[PDB]
Design an enzyme around this catalytic site. Structure first.
Site, mmCIF file in Angstrom:
data_model
loop_
_atom_site.group_PDB
_atom_site.id
_atom_site.type_symbol
_atom_site.label_atom_id
_atom_site.label_comp_id
_atom_site.label_asym_id
_atom_site.label_seq_id
_atom_site.Cartn_x
_atom_site.Cartn_y
_atom_site.Cartn_z
ATOM 1 N N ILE A 32 0.847 -1.194 0.000
ATOM 2 C CA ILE A 32 0.000 0.000 0.000
ATOM 3 C C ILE A 32 0.880 1.241 0.000
ATOM 4 O O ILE A 32 0.512 2.299 -0.550
ATOM 5 C CB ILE A 32 -0.996 0.053 1.149
ATOM 6 C CG1 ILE A 32 -2.043 -1.075 0.993
ATOM 7 C CG2 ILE A 32 -1.757 1.376 1.262
ATOM 8 C CD1 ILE A 32 -2.870 -1.154 2.280
ATOM 9 N N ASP A 60 -0.294 3.271 -6.093
ATOM 10 C CA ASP A 60 -1.064 4.502 -6.220
ATOM 11 C C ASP A 60 -2.542 4.312 -5.878
ATOM 12 O O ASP A 60 -3.451 5.071 -6.323
ATOM 13 C CB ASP A 60 -0.942 5.045 -7.668
ATOM 14 C CG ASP A 60 0.492 5.223 -8.122
ATOM 15 O OD1 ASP A 60 1.287 5.803 -7.336
ATOM 16 O OD2 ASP A 60 0.802 4.788 -9.257
ATOM 17 N N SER A 75 -7.836 5.351 -5.745
ATOM 18 C CA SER A 75 -7.007 5.606 -6.902
ATOM 19 C C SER A 75 -6.403 7.011 -6.816
ATOM 20 O O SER A 75 -7.093 7.975 -7.154
ATOM 21 C CB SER A 75 -7.885 5.515 -8.152
ATOM 22 O OG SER A 75 -7.152 5.494 -9.354
ATOM 23 N N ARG A 76 -5.134 7.072 -6.464
ATOM 24 C CA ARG A 76 -4.490 8.350 -6.179
ATOM 25 C C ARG A 76 -4.322 9.207 -7.417
ATOM 26 O O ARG A 76 -4.425 10.429 -7.302
ATOM 27 C CB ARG A 76 -3.181 8.169 -5.394
ATOM 28 C CG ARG A 76 -3.323 7.323 -4.140
ATOM 29 C CD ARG A 76 -2.271 7.514 -3.084
ATOM 30 N NE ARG A 76 -2.092 6.326 -2.232
ATOM 31 C CZ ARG A 76 -1.107 6.232 -1.325
ATOM 32 N NH1 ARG A 76 -0.248 7.217 -1.137
ATOM 33 N NH2 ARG A 76 -0.985 5.108 -0.628
ATOM 34 N N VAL A 77 -4.109 8.617 -8.580
ATOM 35 C CA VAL A 77 -3.826 9.342 -9.820
ATOM 36 C C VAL A 77 -4.599 8.741 -10.974
ATOM 37 O O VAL A 77 -4.061 8.090 -11.892
ATOM 38 C CB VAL A 77 -2.323 9.245 -10.158
ATOM 39 C CG1 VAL A 77 -1.505 9.814 -9.013
ATOM 40 C CG2 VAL A 77 -1.883 7.817 -10.484
#
Ligand SMILES: Nc1ncnc2c1ncn2[C@@H]1O[C@H](COP(=O)(O)OP(=O)(O)O)[C@@H](O)[C@H]1O
Ligand SMILES: [Mg+2]
Lengths: 318, 122, 255, 128, 156, 317, 128
Positions: free
Chosen positions: G88, G92, G117-119
């Site tokens: 983790i 991303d 979903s970071r990006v």
């Protein structure tokens, strides 16, 4: 740590040893020096030790916390050898007090890795049980004389299953287990009635009324114990008038179990009470029988005989 | 965390689960009878029951009707409370068993590793 | 020696926990690789090779036998610890003792729910089988409701009877020390409870009842005690004679 | 120095937890085999020796004294762990503080049930 | 764990983020009873600040001790005093949350930069019971206490 | 134990042998001498082994508890070799019973420990996954045939997340759960229908029909279970049309899941039944529909094909 | 090869948990010091150096990319364990599959609330 081992053993020397006819030996192993000075000076005062003549009835051997491991691992054997002499060369009833025999085992673990040994569970030396057995088997009455030994036994991190205490259990005939959980409530001595045992607690020895009262006390305490956590959440309102009635007496029995020690007057702020066996049985017998159901729990906390709790009950009015 | 502790809490919370479960069944039975007697009568801890009436609190006919409605409501409430409370206990038991097994495995590993380190440093 | 010469022997190993500590000691000092709780890899093999020697020889090998009752002391109830785990897998079953039952009044502190015998009835007489099967089912039912007891302030007559049988039977399981009884005396006292005769007697009294009832049947009813063996089970006669005895006796007991 | 010249001194050891960590480092680097929690076997003796040096002298020795207040940092509030209990078993009692009491507004956050004095009223005036 | 544990002695202010808070949707996921500061002293931040901060922490700790009970029986067995703490504590928890400019993508709200005075004010008022009539969600993800009200109205 | 395990194994042997030609291999990993002899003599009496004529369908490989750890770690391999012969040389579908897989891991641990290796999580050997995967992969369907493995599992401390069991889960495809509760209801085999699972329980594998029936049975059974509460307390008197049908049907299916094992005959005095996969699907499919609702419970109890349920019924009236 | 030559690749690592156990078998057999869950201190690097290799190149390096979907098996939804938190902390975001949703028939059993979903937004289609 800090539950009462030393106070309790001090109480014992005070009652049993002061009236004891015969010699006594005290071995301070791995314990406080200040306590050594405390005890020494207290014994001179009671005359148990006489510096001006030959009336002394107690020999002392010390090897406290300030010493290196080799000393602490051998003192107990020093104390024990003195006692042995009195036993074999006299047959005389010898009393032996050792505080704290755990320090013989901790001293060994201290030098164990320098001796080249692979550690065993929880860090202890592999020879723990053998080491402890060759010592403890010398601490025994024989056909030649009798030794009444009282050993204070430290329990690392309060865990009674630790290798050290757990191996000591089988060496004894009566065990008095102290709990921080009880002491934390203000009950002293902090004895655990559901964890202290004795080989002579048998109806064909202490007799029927003694046996039954004891068995009845433990039962009412074990009942309550198992409900505590339950009604803690659900509430008391469902307990039948019979159940909730036992919770009352449990609580009183619990408190009636405390007792102001002569030795602990500086901590209790109370005058030491001492209770005879027979009055002890009667007090508890009576409580179990619903008799003092009318008295307040606090009456039972920190008194001597049952009569003092009745008195206190009155004083509680205002 | 502590194995001793978790074990204790699990013994308690397992008891609670069953007791609460049984109280749901008793309430359910009582309510059933009441419900039946509901209409007929209308011709002449128990959840927030007690709470409600009390917070708002600041012959024959009326007495009989009021009491009849009240009993039905009460036993309904209690049945629901217990149902939820035994449910809560179950979920908490499961969550504690997990925690017991994680701690159990880590403890074993940790004591293992101390023993090996001390053997290997010889 | 007894096992191989048509004789039967019983061996108690008290305790195997300590034999294992002794072995562990030697193993670590010989610098053998340590494992869980610092025990050596072949610690299971120590006990297995020991217990397996316990055995029931066939008629061609004399029919003798060796029964073994190993003892294991657990720490704070840890049956999953290493030596316990091993000896529990090697044996045919366990008799579990508990502190909590002990102080509650249950002695021997045997846990009926957890103890087991994979052999079971194969080694139990017909008379005992009979009464024991009913008692095992009743106690099992009791265990399930036993919690609702102190809080079930409106339990139905059905669950309320399960409780009463349950307390009654638990009381008949209590037994004093150093007084092992014969199998006929065990069925007789169990019979009392499993037939419901003691469902009216107050629990606190059941222990005094059993002792009086047993001493009475031992004295006046030897012939009924022998019959219970002979017939292998509870015959139709024994079943009527017992009914007369306990009823009358009970009545006298509560006079 | 004060102790043995009829003066009175107080010493705070803040904190002995870090001291035991530095010892553990030094011991491990000296190639001494690690014991419980990686700490050397004599960790008790490291603190024991130290704390016994704080004492009350008699009049023949000048009647001076050394009082000690070692400090130990627990992890997640467990007073029943190895090290903590090591030091509790050395001193003449302990003052246990707790974040829960601290946040409830009980400051000093002293937990009365777990704290003790092994000296008692002998260390108080008659008034108190 | 050895690393973090040894790191605490080297700081003057610590912000301990929590997985359990974050999962509740609270952001930043700060643990209001585990983050401390050496400056949190009446002679440095002034008595008004010090008092309000101690007030919030006490109501959060009080709520926390009640959680043991809440978990099984729920709130039905709470005194009216207890419930009062539970309502305010829950309004304090949410009002501690705040939309960050850098997290706009995940919160779906404009960022907020609240001045100290306005932070003291809002918390004081919640402690005093001034907004005991607004619904909890009103205090979630806003800036100054005024927006809590505005959001409340919108909810009606 | 006491849940009809030895009887289930014995049936499976006999059933795969009759309907598939392939034999079975029984690997005793850390077998107790006592239980071994008992399982031997029980095999002889059931007929799965013959001390006279070559009708024996099972080969026995025993690695007893008294043996050193190396022996007990190898026995599943020896038994695996025997099974491999019937696969690769006779093209059969062999059945390989491993009792029990936990004792194969433990023997693994004990061996590694004597070898001087640093133990991994929870005490097991470093090579736990590999030791497991090299033995298990030999158990497959190849171009000449296949080995199917029935392996008894002990779950340590009841913890399914224990390295031992979680390792074995990686290789299982299905689980047969035997329960004392069900035994107690006299349902034989004592298979718990809601706990036992299978990976190949996908329409894409066992077909859309088989799938839908299975789901129907599982559902009717979950619903019934739930109703129990109401039935007892609110009384089984206010159950709607849809509610009483569930309870009646559920109970027919439940009882229709019992089945007289061919191996039981020797005691039950009743001819053992081997039900073809078509009769099974159809059978439960019709019950679900309600087509046989006009029959008494005891009609489906300990029968064979659906036909025998009606038959029995008429006789029982 | 794809990534650095203007093309787009997707790699699926199924699963990294099993890799981490094989590496642990190597490490303990080399006698590297065990730590959490008996894993070596470099298990983090084992996955980090691996997953850092999945990237998006800008136009001057050809505009290619490599997308990675590593897979981790938890034990009883314990996403706070060593390995899970490790991956983790590298990736991303995550898509959580709950044992509860699956068994209840929800397929795919995604826990929308815990999945992140970071990006990915920037790469999501305007239609969506
Ligand atoms: N019988 C008692 N009555 C009152 N307080 C006691 C009693 N026993 C112990 N205590 C309190 O607890 C402290 C710890 O006692 P002590 O016997 O020295 O501990 P240990 O069990 O470590 O030997 C004592 O100083 C006193 O304050
Ligand atoms: Mg002491």
């Amino acid at each position: 740590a800090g539950v009462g081992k030393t106070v309790l053993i001090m109480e014992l020397i005070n009652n049993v040893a002061k009236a004891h006819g015969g010699y006594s030996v005290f071995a301070g192993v791995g314990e406080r020096t200040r306590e050594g000075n405390d005890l020494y000076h207290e014994m001179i005062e009671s005359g148990v030790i006489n510096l001006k003549d030959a009336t002394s009835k107690v020999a002392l051997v010390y090897g406290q916390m300030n010493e290196p491991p080799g000393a602490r691992a051998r003192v107990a054997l020093t104390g024990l050898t003195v006692a042995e002499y009195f036993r074999d060369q006299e047959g005389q009833d010898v009393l032996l007090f050792i505080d704290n025999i755990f320090r013989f085992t901790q001293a060994g673990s201290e030098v164990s890795a320098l001796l080249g040994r692979i550690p065993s569970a929880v860090g202890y030396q592999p020879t723990l049980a053998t080491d402890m057995g060759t010592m403890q088997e010398r601490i025994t009455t024989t056909k030649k004389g009798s030794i009444t030994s009282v050993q204070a036994i430290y329990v690392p991190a309060d865990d009674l299953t630790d290798p050290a205490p757990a191996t000591t259990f089988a060496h004894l005939d009566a065990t008095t287990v102290l709990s921080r959980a009880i002491a934390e409530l203000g009950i002293y001595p902090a004895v655990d009635p559901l964890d202290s045992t004795s080989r002579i607690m048998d109806p064909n020895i202490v007799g029927s009324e003694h046996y039954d009262v004891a068995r009845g006390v433990q039962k009412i305490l074990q009942d309550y114990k198992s409900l505590q956590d339950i009604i803690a959440i659900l509430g008391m309102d469902e307990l039948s008038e019979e159940d909730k009635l036992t919770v009352s007496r449990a609580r009183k029995i619990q408190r009636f179990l405390s007792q102001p020690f002569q030795v602990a007057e500086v901590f209790t702020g109370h005058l030491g009470k001492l209770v005879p066996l027979k009055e002890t049985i009667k007090g508890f017998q009576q409580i179990l029988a619903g008799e003092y159901d009318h008295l307040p729990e606090q009456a039972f906390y920190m008194v001597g005989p049952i009569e003092e709790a009745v008195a206190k009950a009155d004083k509680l009015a205002e | 965390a502590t194995l001793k502790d978790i074990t204790r809490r699990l013994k308690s919370i397992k008891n609670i689960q069953k007791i609460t479960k049984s109280m749901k069944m008793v309430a359910a039975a009582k309510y059933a009878r009441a419900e039946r007697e509901l209409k007929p009568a209308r011709v002449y801890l128990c959840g927030a029951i007690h709470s409600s009436v009390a917070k708002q609190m600041k012959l024959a006919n009326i007495i009989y009707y009021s009491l009849k409605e009240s009993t039905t409501s009460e036993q309904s409430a209690r049945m629901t409370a217990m149902d939820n409370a035994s449910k809560n206990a179950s979920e908490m038991i499961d969550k504690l068993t997990l925690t017991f097994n994680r701690t159990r495995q880590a403890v074993i590993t940790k004591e293992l590793i101390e023993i090996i380190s001390g053997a290997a440093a010889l | 020696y007894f096992r191989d010469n048509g004789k039967h022997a019983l061996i108690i190993y008290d305790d195997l926990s300590k034999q294992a500590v002794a072995y562990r000691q030697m193993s670590l000092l010989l610098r053998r690789p340590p494992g869980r709780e610092a025990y050596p890899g072949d610690v299971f093999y120590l006990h297995s090779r020991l217990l397996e020697r316990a055995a029931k020889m066939n008629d061609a090998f004399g029919g003798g036998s060796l029964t073994a009752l190993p003892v294991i002391e657990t720490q704070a109830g840890d049956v999953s610890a290493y030596i316990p785990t091993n000896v529990i897998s090697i044996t045919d079953g366990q008799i579990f003792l508990e502190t909590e039952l002990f102080y509650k009044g249950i002695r021997p502190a045997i846990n009926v729910g957890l103890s087991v015998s994979r052999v079971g009835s194969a080694a139990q007489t017909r008379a005992m089988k009979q009464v024991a099967g009913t008692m095992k089912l009743e106690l099992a039912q009791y265990r399930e409701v036993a919690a609702f007891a102190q809080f079930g302030s409106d339990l139905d007559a059905a669950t309320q009877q399960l409780l009463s049988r349950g307390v009654r039977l638990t009381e008949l399981l209590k037994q004093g020390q150093y007084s092992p009884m014969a199998i006929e005396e065990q069925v007789a006292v169990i019979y009392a409870g499993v037939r419901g005769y003691l469902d009216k007697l107050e629990p606190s009294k059941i222990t005094k009842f059993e002792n009086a009832f047993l001493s009475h049947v031992i004295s006046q009813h030897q012939a009924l005690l022998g019959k219970i063996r002979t017939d292998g089970k509870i015959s139709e006669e024994s079943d009527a004679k017992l009914k007369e005895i306990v009823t009358n006796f009970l009545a006298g007991f509560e006079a």
